[PDB]
């Protein structure tokens, strides 16, 4: 028998640190945007062990973990550093409920870092899935037995010893410690919801819903698995009122009306209900839920100057830089109301933006900005060097896959490429390939083009500087929108709340909290008065929370402070939006 579960004290106490039950932690649907009413969540305690990165599978699993919080953070029950000479094995049984007999029984993982190979019943589930941000999954169906089944799972992290999609994860000791700059605590091993759903043979794996309100109409191609012979219907309603439906074929796009169109913006997210069923003459042969909302984004002229326009008008994107970090759960919120509240905060004080910082969070993420209002910037997180021939299909095809998961998404309008110069590479070849592939969204070739070594492409829809403290002077091309992709950066040390006491830099550390508050809205009024009119489009303010030793957040890193007047925030930013407009 292995050792039982233990708690681990957290660093730091999020408001739900102690929240986060045992056996069935997140347990929530992991995927709204494509919805089946059959599945079950394999989160919660299995066997864990440690070996060598070159080992097979143990005879013995010494431990226990709690999936799905990796091996470095508190909630796991481990808290221990993993480096690129281990490997981290899991072990669970499971049963298939009976009711799913004739399907196929697909095992969906949300997201592991690096490197996942399953086995189920002890054979091997499918290849090596390389990448720590795009989901995954495979039919198991001719694996499984009719009772208890066993499932393992092998994960190996190199973190940036390697030469993949690592963002700010650094092999470090887990306890809290003076220093680490910018870059914080690797995330090692399985990090999002591990699920069962059953499915027809020939079923829909992916829905690409691209709105169309000026021709009052939904774009969709409807794909998957032994479906390409067929036709489709897709339906558009609201409550119980049917809005459009059409028929088409499978794997091109084709119209469904939708008339009169309510369009989605920050201040009223409406989303419309879409199903989507493959057929067989007048039978379904699958059917799933989905949702869009009716929004889109392009660049345009706009009282002399180029412009990103939301619906063909122009507004303000003022946001915040979010880096998905937890002190408990490291790179895994410990509940979805702690997922959902950094989103929420950004509309309590008035942002209608946020910029995910070099990671990629689980699509449940991505449904609450689409359900709250917030236009989304979507870095993909970058390579800690120059990526040789290898790394580069690997990256491509990581970013491939991450952009193929996204299409539907209402908030998500911007894809940043690479930032400040990080394992850069072939700038302007990757803006004109991402646009080519993600049209309908805009295009940063590089974040921080002014500063770090880091080379302009040229390309894509937006300059991007980065200018602490900020705002600066950037101005739009005759060609490309100005955007401030990273400000700000101002400190306070909150007695109480410092991951490591006495540990916390910033960009300008502030006395108290008055000057915090006098300072930001300060900036915030000059990119209204000075920036905006002179044509800064966006601004980034760094960040929604302190992170490890960084204290710049509008939050503690611990989520117990706001340290910022809401009021006196929501204030300034919803003049600096309605002067936009
Ligand atoms: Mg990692």
């Given at each position: 028998a292995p050792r039982a579960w233990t708690p681990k004290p957290s660093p730091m106490t999020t408001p739900w640190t102690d929240q986060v039950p045992v056996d069935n932690p997140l347990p929530e649907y992991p995927r709204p945007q494509l919805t089946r009413p059959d599945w079950a969540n394999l989160n919660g305690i299995w066997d864990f062990?440690?070996?060598?990165?070159?080992?097979?599978?143990?005879?013995?699993?010494?431990?226990?973990?709690?999936?799905?919080?990796?091996?470095?953070?508190?909630?796991?029950?481990?808290?221990?550093?993993?480096?690129?000479?281990?490997?981290?094995?899991?072990?669970?049984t499971f049963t298939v409920p009976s009711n799913w007999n004739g399907r196929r029984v697909q095992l969906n993982f949300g997201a592991s870092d690096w490197r996942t190979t399953v086995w189920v019943n002890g054979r091997q589930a499918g290849a090596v899935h390389s990448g720590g941000y795009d989901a995954f999954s495979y039919d198991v169906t001719d694996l499984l037995t009719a009772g208890t089944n066993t499932l393992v799972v092998s994960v190996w992290d190199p973190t940036e010893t390697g030469t993949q999609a690592v963002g700010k994860q650094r092999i470090r000791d887990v306890a809290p410690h003076?220093?680490?700059?910018?870059?914080?605590?690797?995330?090692?091993?399985?990090?999002?919801?591990?699920?069962?759903?059953?499915?027809?043979?020939?079923?829909?794996?992916?829905?690409?819903?691209?709105?169309?309100?000026?021709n009052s109409r939904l774009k969709v191609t409807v794909r998957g698995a032994g479906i390409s012979g067929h036709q489709a219907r897709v339906t558009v309603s609201t409550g119980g009122t049917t809005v459009g439906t059409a028929t088409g074929?499978?794997?091109?796009?084709?119209?469904?009306?939708?008339?009169?169109?309510?369009?989605?913006?920050?201040?009223?997210?409406?989303?419309?209900?879409?199903?989507?069923?493959?057929?067989?003459?007048?039978?379904?042969?699958?059917?799933?839920?989905?949702?869009?909302?009716?929004?889109?984004?392009?660049?345009?002229?706009?009282?002399?100057?180029?412009?990103?326009?939301l619906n063909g008008k122009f507004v303000f994107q003022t946001g915040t830089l979010d880096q998905?970090?937890?002190?408990?759960?490291?790179?895994?919120?410990?509940?979805?109301?702690?997922?959902?509240?950094?989103?929420?905060?950004?509309?309590?004080?008035?942002?209608?933006?946020?910029?995910?910082?070099?990671?990629?969070?689980?699509?449940?993420?991505?449904?609450?900005?689409?359900?709250?209002?917030?236009?989304?910037?979507?870095?993909?997180?970058?390579?800690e060097r120059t990526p040789d021939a290898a790394a580069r299909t690997q990256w491509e095809a990581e970013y491939d896959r991450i952009i193929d998961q996204h299409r539907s998404s209402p908030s998500l309008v911007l894809w940043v490429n690479q930032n400040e110069g990080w394992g850069q590479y072939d700038q302007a070849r990757l803006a004109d390939k991402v646009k080519a592939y993600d049209p309908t969204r805009l295009?940063?070739?590089?974040?921080?083009?002014?500063?770090?070594?880091?080379?302009?492409?040229?390309?894509?829809?937006?300059?991007?500087?980065?200018?602490?403290?900020?705002?600066?002077?950037?101005?739009?091309?005759?060609?490309?929108?100005?955007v401030l992709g990273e400000f700000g950066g101002l400190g306070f040390k909150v007695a109480?709340?410092?991951?490591?006491?006495?540990?916390?830099?910033?960009?300008?550390?502030?006395?108290?909290?008055?000057?915090?508050?006098?300072?930001?809205?300060?900036?915030?009024?000059?990119?209204?008065?000075?920036?905006?009119?002179?044509?800064?489009?966006?601004?980034?303010?760094?960040?929604?929370?302190?992170?490890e030793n960084e204290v710049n957040g509008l939050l503690t890193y611990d989520r117990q402070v706001v340290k910022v007047d809401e009021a006196r925030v929501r204030a300034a930013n919803r003049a600096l939006i309605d002067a936009s407009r």
């Open positions: 062990a440690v070996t060598s990165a070159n080992a097979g599978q143990p005879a013995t699993f010494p431990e226990q973990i709690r999936v799905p919080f990796v091996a470095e953070s508190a909630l796991s029950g481990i808290q221990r550093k993993i480096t690129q000479n281990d490997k981290l094995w899991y072990k669970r003076p220093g680490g700059g910018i870059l914080y605590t690797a995330a090692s091993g399985i990090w999002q919801t591990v699920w069962l759903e059953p499915t027809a043979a020939a079923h829909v794996t992916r829905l690409d819903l691209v709105p169309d309100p000026a074929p499978v794997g091109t796009e084709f119209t469904v009306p939708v008339p009169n169109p309510r369009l989605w913006t920050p201040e009223d997210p409406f989303l419309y209900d879409v199903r989507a069923d493959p057929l067989s003459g007048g039978t379904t042969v699958d059917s799933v839920g989905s949702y869009t909302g009716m929004r889109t984004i392009a660049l345009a002229s706009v009282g002399g100057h180029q412009r990103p326009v998905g970090y937890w002190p408990d759960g490291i790179y895994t919120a410990p509940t979805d109301a702690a997922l959902r509240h950094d989103l929420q905060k950004h509309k309590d004080l008035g942002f209608n933006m946020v910029r995910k910082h070099i990671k990629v969070e689980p699509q449940r993420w991505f449904y609450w900005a689409d359900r709250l209002g917030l236009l989304v910037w979507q870095d993909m997180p970058n390579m295009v940063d070739n590089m974040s921080g083009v002014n500063c770090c070594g880091a080379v302009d492409g040229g390309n894509g829809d937006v300059v991007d500087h980065h200018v602490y403290v900020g705002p600066g002077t950037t101005v739009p091309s005759a060609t490309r929108a100005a109480g709340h410092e991951w490591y006491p006495g540990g916390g830099f910033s960009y300008e550390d502030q006395p108290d909290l008055a000057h915090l508050n006098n300072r930001f809205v300060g900036l915030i009024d000059a990119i209204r008065e000075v920036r905006m009119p002179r044509g800064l489009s966006a601004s980034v303010h760094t960040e929604i929370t302190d992170v």
